[PDB]
Amino acid sequence: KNILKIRRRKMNHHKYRKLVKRT
Amino acid sequence: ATPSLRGRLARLGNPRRPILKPNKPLILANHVGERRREKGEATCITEMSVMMACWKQNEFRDEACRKEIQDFFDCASRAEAARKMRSIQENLGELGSLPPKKLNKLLHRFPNKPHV
Amino acid sequence: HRFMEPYLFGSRLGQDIIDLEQTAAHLQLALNFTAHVAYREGIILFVSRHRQFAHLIETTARDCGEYAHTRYFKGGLLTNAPLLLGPGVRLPDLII
Amino acid sequence: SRYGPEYKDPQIDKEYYRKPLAEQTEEEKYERDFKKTQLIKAAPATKTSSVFEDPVISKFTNMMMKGGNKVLARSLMTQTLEAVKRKQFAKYHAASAEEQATIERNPYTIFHQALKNCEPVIGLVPILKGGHFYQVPVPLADRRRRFLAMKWMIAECREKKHRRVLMPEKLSQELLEAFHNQGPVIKRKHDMHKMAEANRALAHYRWW
Amino acid sequence: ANHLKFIARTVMVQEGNVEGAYRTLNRILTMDGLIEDIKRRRYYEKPCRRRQRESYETCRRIYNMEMARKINFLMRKNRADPWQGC
Amino acid sequence: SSFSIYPPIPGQENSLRWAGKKFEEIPIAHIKASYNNTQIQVVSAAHQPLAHASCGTEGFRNAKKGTGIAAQTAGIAAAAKATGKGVTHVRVVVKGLGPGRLSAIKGLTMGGLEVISITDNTPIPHXGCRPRKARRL
RNA sequence: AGAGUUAAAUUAUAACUAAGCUGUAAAAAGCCCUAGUUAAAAUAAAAUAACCCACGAAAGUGACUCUAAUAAUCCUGACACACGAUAGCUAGGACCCAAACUGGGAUUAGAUACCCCACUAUGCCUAGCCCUAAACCCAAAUAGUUACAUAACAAAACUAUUCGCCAGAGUACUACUCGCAACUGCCUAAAACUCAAAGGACUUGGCGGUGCUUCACAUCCACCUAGAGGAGCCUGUUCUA
Ligand SMILES: [K+]
Ligand SMILES: [K+]
Ligand SMILES: [K+]
Ligand SMILES: [Mg+2]
Ligand SMILES: [Mg+2]
Ligand SMILES: [Mg+2]
Ligand SMILES: [Mg+2]
Ligand SMILES: [Mg+2]
Ligand SMILES: [Mg+2]
Ligand SMILES: [Mg+2]
Ligand SMILES: [Mg+2]
Ligand SMILES: [Mg+2]
Ligand SMILES: [Mg+2]
Ligand SMILES: [Mg+2]
Ligand SMILES: [Mg+2]
Ligand SMILES: [Mg+2]
Ligand SMILES: [Mg+2]
Ligand SMILES: [Mg+2]
Ligand SMILES: [Mg+2]
Ligand SMILES: [Mg+2]
Ligand SMILES: [Mg+2]
Ligand SMILES: [Mg+2]
Ligand SMILES: [Mg+2]
Ligand SMILES: [Mg+2]
Ligand SMILES: [Mg+2]
Ligand SMILES: [Mg+2]
Ligand SMILES: [Mg+2]
Ligand SMILES: [Mg+2]
Ligand SMILES: [Mg+2]
Ligand SMILES: [Mg+2]
Ligand SMILES: [Mg+2]
Ligand SMILES: [Mg+2]
Ligand SMILES: [Mg+2]
Ligand SMILES: [Mg+2]
Ligand SMILES: [Mg+2]
Ligand SMILES: [Mg+2]
Ligand SMILES: [Mg+2]
Ligand SMILES: [Mg+2]
């Protein structure tokens, strides 16, 4: 199902929102 | 009367926004669902409580609780009789409405036509 | 049915009325066609899956000397004839 | 089971056949028993038409049996009835005028009455719910209560008796103790009632 | 709070039985839907869930009341078949 | 025998007197049947409390007090204390929806107290305080 | 969009009675300044009607009353003008109740989670900003046709005028750049490099601590009898040799 793409975009946004916070 | 099904579902020729979003299509099947078994509840509670009153009031001796003890036995037999006969008769008792097996055969003789 | 519109004379209070003038024209050819295939020694089969005239239709074919099948129709009867009936079977030349 | 489904349990009571003319519905029952040509099982070796037998004695005799010694089990049950009879006879002799016509000298009457006082009225069955076991009281059936009384009698006199004291005499003492509602078996019956009354709010868990 | 007391949602027992009177009260609340309403107000349902619940309640009420009509309509066709073994 | 379910309206004059007193003069038995406890209080026509009882005060503790039997025992105890003060009939008002509604009603019946009217006064907000969130058990 | 208004519930608060009250599958913690009944502001939210499908351009709106009021003589159209749930920010006011964060209790190998109790931001009113959503009916606007014709699935197929958008997948609602009352932000949006696939729908099988119904006669539970695990001995493995 299309959830295999929303989850991939979920992780990237969740990791980017920690790269901004850390630096 | 049946609720109106006009301008409810999401269709191309529908200006009104959707009001109903069914999980499965509203197509009548050729069979009805089976009857659901009635969940059980604890029996002989109003008779056990009064029995416990005499036991606590007489040092757990049935020398004066004979009236309560017999009713507890009577309730157990009464509950036993009803529990061991409800299943067989309820299948064909039908409460005025045909059992699921008969309704399935009746519906098969006059099936629904989604196609053509 | 949608294809029966040309054959309908009209509808009377929600009840369709079949145009008998077109029925007479069709029935005249149907009887004429039925007789000719019987004249040439043809096998005629009466098929009717209706449980109110099954006996009457079955008796009708017996008097005419022709065959009738008003019972349940098996799946591979007319198509897979050799297996259902026998090794060499002559298929009916007309079905009513 | 070498007997098929058609075979039925035989009727042994002689009095049921010798006086059938006083009833009509029961006459229809046994006249159709052979008119249906229903096969009858062989008579069991234990049960007999002797008027001196008793069904409660046979069940109690069987449970006392260990291994396959029916002779030894029957011998023990014979001595126990004799031992009870001897003690009651001695007590009758050494009694006053009012005490004489109180003592019971019938061991069968004592044995039947003793077990009817050792039967619990309400039992317990564990019920699993929420990952834990709750002791929920239940209205035990008559057959279970009768069987449970016999097991308690045998369990007590087999375990906490002395090595010197014989089995027939030790069981005789407990029968008299249970006849007067003071034996340890009666204490165990009350203990089961204590636990049942304590968990009187958990009866809602059961679904029958 | 401001209305008179012992007028609304009140029944009176007859001939001295109370189990019968209580069941009459429950049928009053169930028909008016208060019993289910109290069940749903124990916790809070978001408006997203409220509309999704009213789209399943309405759909069931349509299918059930339509299958019910077909059963009644076809109920007369349950007599013994007069053409058995025809 | 024409019997009306609706209560006798105070404005009118209905010749239906229990134990020599009118309808409004009969005491009240408040029943608050929550999901974990059942509290029973009997009050006079002037809203003066007579007796109070609950599953907690009758020895039941923790989860046990929320069961039906606990509410049944509370009904028996409350009636006995009420009957001691000399009350025969009472108008029982049920508050809230819980497992102890049925038991408390018949608890007063078997405790030596007679009921004539049943009222349900469950708190029903008309739109009100926002209740707590859901439980994802 | 303004102005005025309040039925049901809840709370401050007072009287009376009671010793306990809340809470869970089961408990603890918390409370005892508490609970029940009677009397009762403010704030907040709008049972049944609604099995109705109306209004607005969309997001949205369904307690009552009054005032003002819903463009175009009735096509398409942007980066321009105006608007845009909820969360979030700035200043003042309100605070019943709910409640991220935080503290306590419990569960667990751990539980900085699910469950229980307390309370804050905040949800609310006035003025300003932010301009993001599965902003999805995933189906663009205006005129039409039921002809031709079934990839699959779904909400049947198509024609005319016009605008917007789309050129493998990952990298990527990212780097750099322009604008913005934004400054951990929004919009616009690549490449180096890696792979020969990514992706939509369907079919059968297996599985499901998914639901409904039915059933285990040595059998899963309830339940019956005799034994193994404890000791010596016999014998068979592993290890030691
Ligand atoms: K309202
Ligand atoms: K399958
Ligand atoms: K061994
Ligand atoms: Mg990634
Ligand atoms: Mg519209
Ligand atoms: Mg779906
Ligand atoms: Mg008010
Ligand atoms: Mg305003
Ligand atoms: Mg504590
Ligand atoms: Mg208070
Ligand atoms: Mg205040
Ligand atoms: Mg709507
Ligand atoms: Mg417009
Ligand atoms: Mg307009
Ligand atoms: Mg324009
Ligand atoms: Mg906004
Ligand atoms: Mg906001
Ligand atoms: Mg805000
Ligand atoms: Mg800032
Ligand atoms: Mg502020
Ligand atoms: Mg606050
Ligand atoms: Mg709070
Ligand atoms: Mg913690
Ligand atoms: Mg929306
Ligand atoms: Mg879109
Ligand atoms: Mg759109
Ligand atoms: Mg457009
Ligand atoms: Mg327009
Ligand atoms: Mg159009
Ligand atoms: Mg296909
Ligand atoms: Mg292409
Ligand atoms: Mg690329
Ligand atoms: Mg984004
Ligand atoms: Mg960005
Ligand atoms: Mg086994
Ligand atoms: Mg051995
Ligand atoms: Mg060993
Ligand atoms: Mg060994």
DSSP string, D33-64: HHHTT--BPPPPSS--S-TT--HHHHHHHHHH
Q: Is E25 on the interface with F (CB under 8 A)?
A: yes
Residues D118 and D191: their CA atoms lie apart, in Å, by: 12
Identity at D23, one-letter amino acid code: E
Burial label for D181, CB within 10 Å (0-12, 13-18, 19+), is: middle
Asked if D205's CB is within 8 angstroms of B60's CB, the reply is no
Q: Using an 8 Å Cβ cutoff, are B32 and B97 in contact?
A: no
Q: Which nucleotide is nearest to F31 (CA to C1')?
A: G36
CA angle, B72 as apex, B66 and B77 as ends, to 5°?
125
Minimal-distance CA residue of chain F relative to B47 = F69
β-bridge mates for residue C68, sequence order: C46
**Ligand 36 center from residue D66 Cα (angstroms):** 13
User: How is residue D119 written in tokens?
Assistant: 């039967």
Q: What's the Å distance between residue F130 CA and nucleotide G11 C1'?
A: 14
- Find the helix packing angle between D184-198 and D142-159, rounded to 10°: 130
Asked if B98's CB is within 8 angstroms of E74's CB, the reply is no
Residues F101 and F133: their CA atoms lie apart, in Å, by: 26
Q: Which nucleotides of G are covered by protein (CB under 7 A)?
A: 7-10, 16-28, 35-40, 44-48, 51-54, 56, 59, 63, 96-100, 114-116, 123, 134, 137-139, 154-156, 170-174, 184-185, 199-201, 212-214, 222-226
Q: Is B110 on the interface with E (CB under 8 A)?
A: yes
The domain limits of chain B are 1-116
Q: What's the Å distance between residue E44 CA and nucleotide G133 C1'?
A: 23
Experimental determination approach used: cryo-EM
Q: Using an 8 Å Cβ cutoff, are D77 and D63 in contact?
A: no
Phi, psi of D174 (to 5 degrees): -70, -30
CA angle, B17 as apex, B13 and B22 as ends, to 5°?
90
Q: Which residue is nearest to nucleotide G37 (CA to C1')?
A: F47
Least distant ligand from the CA of A12:
4
Q: Please state, in angstroms and as integers, the Cα–Cα distance from residue D100 to each residue in B109, D46, D88, D89, D179, following that order.
A: 85, 37, 11, 10, 17
Going C12 to C14 to C20 to C25, the CA torsion angle's sign is positive
Minimal-distance CA residue of chain D relative to B56 = D197
CB contacts of E83 in chain C (<8 Å) are: 51-52, 54
Q: How far apart are the first and last CA of chain A?
A: 35
Minimal-distance CA residue of chain B relative to D198 = B52
Helix/strand/coil for F31: strand
What is the CA D136 to chain-centroid distance, rounded?
25
User: How is residue C32 written in tokens?
Assistant: 């004429």
HEC profile of chain C: CHHHCCCEEEEECCEEEECHHHHHHHHHHHHHHHHHHHHCCCCEEEECCCCCCHHHHHHHHHHHCCEEECCCCCCCCCCCHHHHCCCCCCCCCEEC
C26-53: string of b/e by CB count within 10 Å (b at 16+)? Answer: eeeeeeeeeeeebeeeeebbbebeeeee
Q: What's the Å distance between residue F62 CA and nucleotide G30 C1'?
A: 15
